[PDB]
Write a protein that binds this ligand. Structure first.
Ligand SMILES: [Mg+2]
Length: 596
């Protein structure tokens, strides 16, 4: 039932010195070449697609046709998303078997499973290890992207950061023995770094910790200020305000590390026992006080605030944060707009002086990050009318709210979507199943909220723009799935494609239409199912036209079969935005080619 092979570098097994009885000892030469190459060349870059063709002899594959099929798989390993798989059937099917010599002196038909067994070995014992030996796969934390960084420069990076923590006081060696929480990792940021802990799966604890946070979140609601909602807050604020809105957003510098444990202990210790009894309180206290980590065989005590990556930090930073709110932010104008996430405050007022003071008040309490400050205060050099907050873009002048999309230059869009579920595998003979599991509505529901579909403060044209933007991401996933169908399922007829697509267009438009009517407001004029279906189809057109030489038949089908007249019962709506790929979506990569 195991149909999947993970491209991940944790599937790698250690290669033996020679080879046991089963394996054709033709690969043993390449295995010995692994230790020869590991014996330190070494120049930049020497491509991974070039090292392997020399270490593994060309006589393994036979012809230079089979070699082309195998090195596609190796190329997919070097461009992978997190949790990505291909089929095992890819590793043996459509190969020329007669050209392979070391398989000729063997059963003519028992070859598929033997070729597959040997291929597995090559990937697991040479390919992946020699990648992991030369490189370090790092999560950029932007979707499921994995950037490949040279192991050499990453360790010099790690020693530069490990230096600061050792030289400062943030990290102190314990010596020793006393059971670390997990392993310390130094992950890159923008120009900065990030110090988190990879937790040992000691579970146990997992459901225990899950119970602790559940009860600290019960304390926060019953005791501390019920801190808004964020649709209600903005909705009411815009309704009451008649003038020009002024607003500021501040990012707090390392919020977890700025928490004072002494203060936190007093708070955890302040809770009534019916909400949290002493036994759990006492435990949380010392658990917050005794943060132990391992880095390089040696164990360390972390004592700069809360450790990022611990199960409890999230809710306990939130406990501390809400206390800072009661103490310092309890006197804010009751006619102003106030909201805060974790380390993001968002203050808005018609009165520029009130916003100005909040900045001074906020800059006193916390050490804010000045680069990330977005505001339209006349005091600022380059004032922003639209500010990002909670995955939404708030415009202070128009009061319109749009979805924010985190898409950097030349980012391989396929990284946003997780197409492969290793716990729930789909075999290579059922692409239809795969395509529907991918078109499942949950992945885009976060873009299908009241914040986009209301006509309370959003104009009608804003609603359509939001739906179109959503549907653009759907088409990109659809595209991402098809590329996975072409090179893994190797599809027969593409008959189901039309049925799924039609269902997808028709389903999401009905979901939008439902949301629109529900969160209807005074700015509503008239929306129709016909209009939304049109928008939905055109959203697919714009993305499909990025691969005309593949979707020629599909585009032709849509244009001839579906209705596409861009007709709105509104006059302020520009129809040209709907017949083109939105600009934040142009510069994303659709092509895959082993970068490093
Ligand atoms: Mg933030």
């Amino acid at each position: 039932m195991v149909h999947y092979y993970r491209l991940s570098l944790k599937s790698r097994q250690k290669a033996p010195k020679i080879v046991n009885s089963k394996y054709n000892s033709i690969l043993n030469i390449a295995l010995k070449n692994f230790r020869l190459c590991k014996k330190h060349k070494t120049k930049k870059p020497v491509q991974i697609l070039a090292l392997l063709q020399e270490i593994i002899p060309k006589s393994y594959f036979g012809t230079t046709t089979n070699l082309k099929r195998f090195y596609k798989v190796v190329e997919k390993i070097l461009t992978q998303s997190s949790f990505e798989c291909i089929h095992l059937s890819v590793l043996h099917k459509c190969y020329d078997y007669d050209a392979i010599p070391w398989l000729q002196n063997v059963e003519p038909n028992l070859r598929p499973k033997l070729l597959l067994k040997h291929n597995l070995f090559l990937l697991d014992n040479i390919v992946k290890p020699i990648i992991a030996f030369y490189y370090k796969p790092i999560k950029t934390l932007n979707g499921h992207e994995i950037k490949f960084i040279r192991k050499e420069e990453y360790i010099s990076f790690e020693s530069k950061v490990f230096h600061k923590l050792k030289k400062m006081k943030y990290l102190v060696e314990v010596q020793d023995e006393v059971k670390p929480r997990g392993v310390l990792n130094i992950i890159p940021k923008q120009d900065n770094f990030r110090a988190i802990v990879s937790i040992f799966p000691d579970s146990a604890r997992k459901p225990f910790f899950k119970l602790l946070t559940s009860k600290i979140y019960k304390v926060l609601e019953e005791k501390y200020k019920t801190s808004g909602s964020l649709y209600t807050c903005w909705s009411e604020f815009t309704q009451k305000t008649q003038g020009q809105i002024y607003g500021i957003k501040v990012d707090i510098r390392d919020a977890y590390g700025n928490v004072k444990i002494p203060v936190l202990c007093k708070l955890i210790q302040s809770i009534p026992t019916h909400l949290l009894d002493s036994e759990k309180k006492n435990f949380i206290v010392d658990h917050i006080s005794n943060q132990f980590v391992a880095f390089r065989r040696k164990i360390y005590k972390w004592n700069h605030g809360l450790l990022q990556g611990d199960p409890l930090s999230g809710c306990l930073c939130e406990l501390y944060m809400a206390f800072m709110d009661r103490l310092y932010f309890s006197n804010l104008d009751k006619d102003a707009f106030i909201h805060r996430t974790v380390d993001d405050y968002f203050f808005c007022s018609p009165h520029p002086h009130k916003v100005y003071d909040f900045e001074l008040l906020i800059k006193g309490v916390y050490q804010v990050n000045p680069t990330k400050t977005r505001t339209n205060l006349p005091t600022h050099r380059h004032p922003q009318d639209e500010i990002p907050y909670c995955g939404k873009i708030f415009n202070l002048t128009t009061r319109q709210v749009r979805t924010l999309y985190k898409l950097p230059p030349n980012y391989e869009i396929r990284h946003k979507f997780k197409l492969w579920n290793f716990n729930n595998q789909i075999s290579d003979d059922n692409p239809a199943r795969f395509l529907q599991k991918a078109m499942d509505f949950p992945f885009i529901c976060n873009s299908f909220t009241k914040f986009e579909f209301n006509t309370v403060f959003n104009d009608q044209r804003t609603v359509f723009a939001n739906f179109y933007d959503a549907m653009i991401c759907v088409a990109y996933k659809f595209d991402a799935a098809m590329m996975a169908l072409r090179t893994s399922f190797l599809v027969n007829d593409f008959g189901f494609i039309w049925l799924v697509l039609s269902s997808t267009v028709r389903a999401y438009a009905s979901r939008a239409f439902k949301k629109i009517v529900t969160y209807k407001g005074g700015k509503y004029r008239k929306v129709t199912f016909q209009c939304l279906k049109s928008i939905a189809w055109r959203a697919f057109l714009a993305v499909l036209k990025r691969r005309t030489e593949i979707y020629k038949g599909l585009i032709d089908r849509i244009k001839s079969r579906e209705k596409l007249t861009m007709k709105f019962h509104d006059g302020e709506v520009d129809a040209s935005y709907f017949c083109k790929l939105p600009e934040k979506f142009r510069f994303v990569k659709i092509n895959r080619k082993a970068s490093i």
